[PDB]
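Researcher: Following up on the earlier apo prediction. This time include the ligand. It's 5-methoxy-benzene-1,3-diol, with the SMILES given after the sequence.
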Amino acid sequence: EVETFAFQAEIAQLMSLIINTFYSNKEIFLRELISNSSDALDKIRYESLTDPSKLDSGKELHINLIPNKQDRTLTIVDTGIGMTKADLINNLGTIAKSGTKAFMEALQAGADISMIGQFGVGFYSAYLVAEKVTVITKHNDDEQYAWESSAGGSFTVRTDTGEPMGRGTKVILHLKEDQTEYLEERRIKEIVKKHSQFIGYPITLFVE
Amino acid sequence: EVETFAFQAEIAQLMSLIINTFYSNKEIFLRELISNSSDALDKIRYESLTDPSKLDSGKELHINLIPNKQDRTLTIVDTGIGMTKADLINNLGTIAKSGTKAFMEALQAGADISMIGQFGVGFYSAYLVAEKVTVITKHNDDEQYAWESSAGGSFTVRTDTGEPMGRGTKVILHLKEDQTEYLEERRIKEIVKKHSQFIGYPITLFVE
Ligand SMILES: COc1cc(O)cc(O)c1
Ligand SMILES: COc1cc(O)cc(O)c1
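Model: Understood. Below is the ligand-bound prediction.
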């Protein structure tokens, strides 16, 4: 069972704008996703301050970056709070409709695409580099789900039956043919060092 | 009934460091508090996407800045999610103990105090300019509480019986004798324009 959903009109337009604007500084996608992981990691850590069983699904709070050159995927895995099915449908937990409005109007008064994360919609920067994004998520209060979209106005949700993760979110980037520099160790390292050097959780860059 | 609580040791040390370091760029306090308001405003907006009665305690989502020259207070009011009593005691909803560790170690490898908000503890920047900070908060799931601290290792909590706010958080800054420029309209305007120009909620600077 796969369910198919329409993007709200504003989200579809933000994704078209991300896909269609000439904008060379694409590397900021990784900063945004890490920062989103970091936020999710903060949330489960906060919950666990008063209830240490929240961490029964996994005690370690970390971020992994996994390139795969065969598959043409870069995967960002965190062991954060995860997302419920309701959260995934509701724009991966964001206030994306208002965030898009704030971002469209910032881009009128002198903003560029790099500032997307100031508007709460930094997830969608995945579409700077990826043709398809698959989200695998597990929250304590729910089952494991996969969200998927190649943009074009719709996303799918299904329950994920394969590889149990325990708790957190994996963002799989199926990269565009011309964006494979983001699979090279050197380049991922440089970007993580540039933009994500003060993240409060260990980031492990896997090797192939 | 006033209860008195000890700051966790790490928080007490961060507050001593905020109070005691020579550091001229104090104005960043306002950016941090607005941004904290903005986060709180995002949260009640998200909740209301699936349950519009969350906004029964007030429909408008905004930030007010209220200087008072008589009282020597600058007040930041939002109509965000608010905070429960448990949230206030637990470091005003932050992961402050780990955030302090990440921030102390950033300040070893080339960071300055302006980057406090990258570590989730930007609230405590209030102590750059204030000798006492009073937090009035109301969350839907709880009563109105006042938190207060002049630093020095302890904070108080009491239920607030005066001026019902409905929902949100008011941060009252009782300013240091030498920090009154932050009560001048011109100066608050300049700072809000410098650092908080892309906030997605209206910010109203009150006049006296
Ligand atoms: C904004 O939606 C996201 C939630 C997560 O837990 C991780 C992301 O990369 C995006
Ligand atoms: C980090 O604690 C805060 C919570 C709020 O709702 C508002 C703040 O200024 C700080």
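Model: The first strand of chain B starts at residue 2 and ends at 6.
Researcher: Noted. I'll compare it with the apo version next.
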